[PDB]
Structure formats: C-alpha cells, structure tokens
Ligand binder design. Structure first.
Ligand SMILES: O=C(/C=C/C=C/c1ccc2c(c1)OCO2)N1CCCCC1
Lengths: 252, 256
C-alpha cells in the first residue's frame, strides 16, 4: 500500500532531521552563494588561526591533531546514528545483541555516506558547517595522512551526482543499518523483513521524488559496494597508523 | 515533560544493559539459588580448587585479580558514558576529567550489586569470594575490601534495580564539581536533566519509598570516602611491594 510507505518515508525524514543537526540542504546552502560564509582552512597558517576562531572541542604535530579531530567527530556521529536507528520501526524490538551488531558494522558506512553531504570537489565542511577544509590541504598532509580523505572525496563526488536529498537519504541510511549479512547476527529474519519494508519505501520515494532519474534505485544500491570498499580501505589505513590512556578507551 | 524524562530513562536503561554483561538482576538471581550456582572460595585450599574449576603469593594474586577486573569495568563504564546524551559533545579534556573521577565511584556502586553481607561474586558470577577470606589476607590487603562491604550493605538496603542504577551512574559521571574542568556549565545542564530523570524514575519505580531520591544523593558521600581510602592503600603497596605491578590505565586514573 502506497500510503504506509509514504508514512514510513515521512517518519524517517522527521527523525533524520531531529537526529542530524547539520542536514544536506543546510550544508548545500553553506557551500553555495551566501550571508556569513564559513572560515576556510587551506594552509598551515590558516589552520592555526582557525583553531583560535573555531574553538575546537577536540584540541586537548598537525597531521595527527587533524586525525584526532576526525576521531572526535565520528564518535559524535555514532551517537547521532544510534539515536536515529531507534526511530526505525521494529529496530528496538530486535534482540539487543543484534541491535549492537547492526550499529557496530553499519556506522562507518553511514558516516561516509553522510560526509558526502558535507563535501564538494574542493573540500569538506567542518564544525557543524562553520569551517571549510580544502581538499588540497588534506592531500598535502605528510604520508600516510595525505590520502586518508582522498578516497572519501572520490566517493562523494560520484555519490553527490545522484542529487539525493535528506528525505531520500533518511531511508537509504535506514536500509544500510538493517543489513542482514553483518557477522554474528542471531535472528536475521526480522532484520531482513524490516529491510524489505525500507527498500520498498526507498523505491517509492525515488520514483516519486525523481521521476525522470532512470533506475536511480538500482544505482543507489550499487553505491553500497563503493561504501564497503571505502570501509575496508579505511580500516586498513587505521591499522597502518596503529603501527606508526583513557583517550584510547574513548576511541577503541 | 515527564515523557522526555521517561524516554531518557529508557535510553539509559537500554545502554546500561548493552554495556554491562553482569547486571544487578543477574547477580541477585545467582546469590539466591540451579545451573547458575557459583563456586565458593573461603580459604587457601579453596582458592586453589576454584583455579582449576573457574576461568606469586595469595594475597597479591587476589589483588591483581581485583585490578584486572577494575580495568575491565573502566572499559565498560567508558562505553556507557559515551551513550549518555551530550557526553561526547563536551570538550575532550572534560570527557577525560569526568571519566577519571567518576570511574571509581561507579565501580563501588556497581560492585554493591555483586555483594551481600557474606561476600562478592567474581569471574562474571562463576565464583564467590567470602568476606572473611578477604579480611584474613596478610596486611595491607587485610581490609582492602571491608569498606566496600560496609557500603554495599547500606547501599543495597535502598533496593535499587538496574533501571534506577543506569540513571544514577549517569548522574555520577556528569558531576560539574570535578577538579580541572574547563566548562562546568554544559555538564551541569546535563546533570540537571539527569537528576530530573532520576527523580521521576525513583518516584514511579518506588512510590512507597519516601525520599529515596534524597537518600540516594546522600550516598555520594560514602562513595567519595571509599575512593579516598583506596588510593592511600595503593601508595602503601607501591612502597611495600616494589615487585608488584600496576596496570597503566588504572595508574593514570589514580595519579591525579
Ligand atoms: O585469584 C583469582 C581471582 C581473583 C579475583 C579477585 C577479586 C577480588 C575482589 C573483586 C573481584 C575480583 O571482582 C570484584 O571484586 N582466581 C580465582 C577464580 C579463578 C581464577 C583465579
């Protein structure tokens, strides 16, 4: 029934808004046109001044302090994604261990999806969109830190060409969380059933919200491959840094 | 709005459950009496047989035991803390400062769940070490555990369940009065909302328990005192037992 699907689409849209302070639409505006624009970081000099103008909550060598900052924020996004997951109908009724398993394996995927919303070919919004860090400044970081972020830019550029909006992404992120193939799952059935319902919703959303965009649904599901590659790749990059107190415990 | 507060109570209960394998409810069901029956350790020979049956000098290896398990508890508390709304958004220095001071307070709160007047569950519930065996240990390990027993006896008379504790330990972590905090106010606003949640919880979950909220807040004094005696005990050991090792995660917590 179209109606239940639209209802679910709306429900997720409203929860995405409440959970994710910095939305795609707001980020878009920030990247385009002005009004008070954000502070730009494009060199060493500018980073330093940015510390003083954008009070960093992560600030307890440069390349590392930048890496720690991505850590602080992705820890914050986990909390946001966790809260959003609880609004997805059926999610809280699942086995608790499965809930934890879906969030653990799903959050990197969702982070890099939503980070795309904050990126363009030239850089990425930071600090709830009051900063902009350029792509080239990210690449110039001593190796191996130079290309931590290049892959995400490559992905976002391609991903952003689908022209999704927040209302589309709300459902897509839901579909990602409910992936029945995560390791260690105890009762895959209700996960897949909820995933099926979300997939039907996503399909109707895309067809309605983008009637002239041929097979968008398919193309969007195909991107879930590019996500998983960005993830295995990121994790390998972490293992390389790890080989070259309470703080640890926070960032396990 | 009591609805937002109940929502917050639910959220904290859910995370407590996800973060802490051995709950108060599970511990009590074990201490009552089954297939969940623990092995009891009450004497030296007894220690030895339980080594075989459960997962240096005696007194030390018991102390290293309590030390390994505090390391584990810190890891669990750290995970739980991040689920508390607003915690991870605070300045990182403050996050570290709140965990440093709040962690032992929570360890002794939660250890009460594992205790009764006669002893304490160990090894996730597989074992039970009697209070007397712990008292008899060569000094200064003799009454390392007595203070915690005295607290637990009094604390357990409040009859809290895990859903109450989830909020209470949230209130403990978010204390704006820790030394060296940078931005006391955001912490206090979080605490205020947690305190309101705790008050609605206690009133709803224990309607006949007069002023339980107050009595619970007063227990924060017994906690701070437990924390003080322990640290002094560690400094005795560091000079008696130059040969005994202390886990660095714990070391950082105590050092300051
Ligand atoms: O020496 C030990 C274990 C010692 C545990 C010791 C211990 C003491 C107080 C505690 C605690 C653990 O947890 C909370 O409070 N063994 C007996 C059990 C099997 C392994 C060896």
């Amino acid at each position: 029934e179209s109606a239940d699907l639209r209802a679910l689409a709306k429900h997720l849209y409203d929860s995405y808004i409440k959970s994710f302070p910095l939305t795609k639409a707001k980020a878009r505006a920030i990247l385009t046109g002005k009004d008070k624009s954000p502070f730009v970081i494009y060199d060493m000099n500018s980073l330093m001044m940015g510390e003083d103008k954008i009070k960093f909550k992560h600030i307890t060598e440069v390349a590392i302090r930048i890496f720690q900052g991505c850590q602080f924020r992705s820890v914050e996004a986990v909390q946001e994604i966790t809260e959003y997951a609880k609004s997805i109908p059926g999610f809280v009724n699942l086995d608790l261990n499965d809930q934890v398993t879906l969030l653990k394996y799903g959050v990197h995927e969702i982070i890099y999806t939503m980070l795309a919303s904050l990126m363009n070919k030239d850089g990425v919004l930071i600090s709830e969109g009051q900063g902009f860090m350029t792509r080239e400044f990210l690449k110039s970081l001593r190796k191996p830190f130079g290309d931590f972020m290049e892959p995400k830019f490559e992905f976002a550029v391609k991903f952003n060409a689908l022209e999704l909006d927040d209302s589309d992404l709300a459902i897509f992120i839901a579909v990602i969380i409910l992936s029945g193939d995560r390791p260690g799952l105890l009762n895959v059935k209700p996960i897949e059933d909820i995933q099926d319902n979300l997939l039907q919703a996503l399909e109707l959303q895309l067809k309605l919200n983008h009637p002239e965009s041929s097979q968008l649904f398919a193309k969007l599901l195909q991107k879930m491959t590019d996500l998983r590659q960005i993830v295995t790749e990121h994790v390998q990059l972490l293992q390389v840094i790890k080989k070259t107190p309470l703080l640890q415990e926070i960032y396990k």
